[PDB]
Amino acid sequence: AEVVYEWTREPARSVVVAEDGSRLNQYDLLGQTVDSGIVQSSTGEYVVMTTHFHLKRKIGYFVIQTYLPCIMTVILSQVSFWLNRESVPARTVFGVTTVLTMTTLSISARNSLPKVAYATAMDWFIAVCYAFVFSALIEFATVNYFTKRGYAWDGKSVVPEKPKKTFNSVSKIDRLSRIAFPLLFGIFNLVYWATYLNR
């Protein structure tokens, strides 16, 4: 009843952004939407002029620094399926170091954000990568459990078949995992990116 605000030009034209003056680092200013309205309060009614700047986050930094190390760690863990089953300390080193690296990435992912109590897409991706790495570790553990004799193939021996000195056969678990784990990880990546990028 005392003071009323309005836009000089039309509301869209009354909020102008300078072309060169864009100080955003990891955001794209798609545009602005302008509006005017009223608000109630214990003191009375007030005319309030509102603007809304629409900002889309830039995924390049996170793709470089979090998602891609996670994928490389997953691939590193899955590489363990190709070494011989008698390479117990080596495959244990793969599993242990990959799990530690994924734990470190999980810890460092939350640093960029505020301490919100809900789970994000990055958190779900890290969780699934951790599940894949831990699954590879348990796969190696089962392979070692089913390993019969603890000495590897000499190389010169003419191995007999599978229906003197005997040798272990190539693990069926390893043979299946070599084609199962990368395929499942790729399908998960496809589903995740298709779900999240298009929205």
Partner: protein, 170 residues
């Protein structure tokens, strides 16, 4: 301490706003960064770890634990160099020259570990099957030949990568 002022410039003009034109003076400096700090901090560990990664070629194929420890430690050191770099920079969305160099070094150590895995798979994986059945690339049956080929190729490829990187970014 970091930069050096290559030159400075003065400009006078008129800038136009909705209210009207106004006078404008601009004092600009063209700063050029110094590379000694980065050479000491990020690069030189990266190259030295890259030479560290190639020691696995000279170790015998049967000694699996040594080569695996070497490869995994090199990957870990590349990752910790990268994270201790990115902790002190803004969240820019595009790859920098130092990021490209770190990715190249990471790729090199990754190929070192992967070609060790390939040698192990050739020996222990295809070995019994082949036995029951019974620069140019090497023959894919002789692990010693594969190791020699890696020995002579990895330094050459790394030197070529460094050459193109420096001649492009300098």
């Amino acid at each position: 301490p970091q930069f050096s002022i290559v030159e400075h410039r003065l400009v006078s003009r008129n800038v136009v706003f909705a209210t009207g034109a106004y006078p404008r003076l601009s004092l600009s400096f063209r700063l050029k960064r110094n590379i000694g700090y980065f050479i000491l901090q990020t690069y030189m560990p990266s190259i030295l770890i890259t030479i560290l990664s190639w020691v696995s070629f000279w170790i015998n194929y049967d000694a699996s634990a040594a080569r695996v420890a070497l490869g995994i430690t090199t990957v870990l050191t590349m990752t910790t160099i990268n994270t201790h770099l990115r902790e002190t920079l803004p969240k820019i969305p595009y790859v920098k020259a130092i990021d490209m160099y770190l990715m190249g070094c990471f790729v090199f150590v990754f190929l070192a570990l992967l070609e060790y895995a390939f040698v192990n798979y050739i020996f222990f994986g295809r070995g019994p099957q082949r036995q029951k059945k019974l620069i140019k690339i090497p023959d894919l049956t002789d692990v010693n030949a594969i190791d020699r080929w890696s020995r002579i190729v990895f330094p050459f490829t790394f030197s070529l990568f460094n050459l193109v990187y420096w001649l492009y970014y300098v």
